[PDB]
């Protein structure tokens, strides 16, 4: 029966400060609403940063440190870096539970963009053996997370068959990605080449196995 | 960048937070390399030839 | 130090009931409490209540109070979060947190819920091995294709799981009912075919384990 409000996206550059804050609708967030800082890298990865407004929890860089800034509670990254990416949640106490904020998307300058590693694998022999073919194309390691894969059986851009899973971040912030054109046994014999083709911040890439 | 004396240490700015960098990468010049003669916080002491 | 590991992600049709726990790792369980967090797809996060590892007893956000039941096995510093008479619109991850600090410190790794009516379905392993001709590269990517399972999840290690660097695994999807899956993993060009190279698939809603060692086509 409260509402946090949290900024929805702020974009810095490495090296800069930025402020997120955390606004409550019943009226200005004081000491006894214990503001919490979560931060949720890509994995559902979650960590928490500061409690009881200005606690930074162990092992949390000092370049994060919470306050109330007006009537609101406030996170502010001194020097922010590449790896503070991440959506950051704020929690509210009131008096007997907590209400989250919806989060908020920071994005840090870094990460030099990284082409994809993609790879295409024919359909297995054990799954000739079904009546199917499935050719996996597999992409990797791209940055800025955003790709497009487009096939092409025999010179002609297939159009149907195909499934395109949504980038993925890995570990290291980098993303990945595989897409699925699935024949038959049958489609498979009868065509003879086939290519799955990646485009990533403007070059493309071209994989092509041939039966 | 935590405040303590360190020859072989530089401390410079780094969108908006405070970075450690190397003495050895520090350079002056004017038309040919100078030599450095000394340093400390904002202050460089060097030799440089007509530029 | 601190490690909140949660249990896999299930697989119910409505009207289940599922038993989450989190087994906690590094603190001493009776001096800091539990937190069930529910982070919805779309939605964000929400505080589903607290437990008090003393005493035992829940608080429940009033959104959770009825089919949501909080107790812990506190012999073995677990707490776990059961959702009785599934409804359909409990798809979501559901993470424990520790309470200390005035909020909260350490959150857990989630477990996933997929409320769904469906049979089950064992999955095909396909070992992915590069094209029939050349490939020289000072490296190398093979891959494994885990498809047409239900429910989910499926397990999936390289080599009993001793190598992981190098491996992506990719998010299961359902398509035409079931859910397919997929990794791949790269090394350097010595490695293989020279010393083995396997798939470890398991699908635990039907018993089913498969090792696929990666074949050279030819």
């Known amino acids: 029966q409260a509402v946090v409000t949290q900024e929805s996206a702020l974009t810095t550059s490495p090296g800069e400060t930025v402020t997120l804050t955390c606004r409550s609708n019943?009226?200005?967030?004081?000491?006894?609403?214990?503001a919490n800082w979560v931060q949720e890298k890509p994995d559902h990865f979650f960590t928490g940063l500061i409690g009881?407004?200005?606690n930074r929890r162990s092992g949390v860089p000092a370049r994060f440190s919470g306050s109330l800034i007006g009537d609101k509670a406030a996170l502010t990254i001194t020097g922010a870096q590449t790896e503070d990416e991440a959506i950051y949640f704020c929690?509210?106490?009131?008096?007997?539970?907590?209400?989250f904020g919806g989060g908020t998307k920071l994005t840090v300058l870094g990460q030099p963009k990284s082409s994809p590693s993609v790879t295409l694998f024919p359909p297995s022999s054990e799954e000739l053996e079904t009546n199917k073919a499935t050719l996996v194309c597999t992409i990797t390691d791209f940055y800025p997370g955003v790709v497009t894969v487009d096939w092409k059986v025999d010179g002609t851009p297939v159009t149907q068959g195909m499934e395109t899973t949504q980038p993925s971040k890995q570990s290291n912030n980098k993303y990945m990605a595989s897409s699925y054109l699935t024949l038959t046994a049958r489609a498979w014999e009868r065509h003879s080449s086939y290519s799955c083709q990646v485009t990533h911040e403007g070059h493309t890439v071209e994989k092509s196995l041939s039966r | 960048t935590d405040d303590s004396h360190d020859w072989t240490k530089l401390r410079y700015m780094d969108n908006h937070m405070p970075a450690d960098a190397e003495r050895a990468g520090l350079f002056v010049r004017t038309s040919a390399p100078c030599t450095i003669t000394g340093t400390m916080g904002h202050f460089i002491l060097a030799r440089c030839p007509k530029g | 130090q601190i490690q909140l590991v949660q249990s896999g992600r299930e697989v119910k049709n409505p009207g289940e009931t599922v038993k989450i726990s989190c087994k906690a790792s590094?603190?001493?369980?009776?001096?800091?409490?539990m937190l069930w967090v529910k982070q919805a797809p779309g939605k964000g996060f929400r505080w589903m209540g607290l437990?008090?590892?003393?005493?035992?007893?829940?608080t429940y956000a009033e959104e959770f109070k009825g089919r949501f039941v909080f107790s812990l096995e506190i012999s073995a510093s677990t707490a776990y979060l059961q959702i009785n008479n599934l409804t359909n619109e409990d798809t979501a991850t559901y993470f424990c947190?520790?309470?200390?600090?005035?909020?909260?410190?350490?959150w857990g790794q989630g477990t996933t819920l997929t409320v769904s009516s469906a049979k089950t379905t064992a999955p095909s392993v396909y070992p992915l091995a590069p094209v029939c001709g050349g490939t020289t590269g000072s490296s190398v990517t093979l891959g494994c294709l885990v498809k047409g399972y239900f429910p989910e999840p499926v397990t999936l290690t390289w080599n009993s799981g001793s190598l992981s660097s190098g491996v992506h695994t990719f998010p299961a999807l359902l398509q035409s009912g079931l859910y397919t899956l997929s990794s791949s993993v790269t090394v350097t060009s010595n490695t293989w075919p020279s010393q083995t190279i396997t798939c470890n698939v398991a699908h635990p809603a039907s018993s089913t384990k498969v090792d696929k060692k990666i074949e050279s086509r030819r």
């Open positions: 947190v520790r309470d200390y600090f005035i909020s909260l410190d350490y």
């Open positions: 590094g603190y001493t369980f009776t001096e800091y409490p």
């Open positions: 437990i008090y590892t003393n005493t035992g007893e829940p």
């Open positions: 019943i009226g200005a967030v004081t000491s006894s609403n214990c």
């Open positions: 009881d407004t200005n």
């Open positions: 929690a509210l106490w009131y008096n007997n539970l907590w209400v």
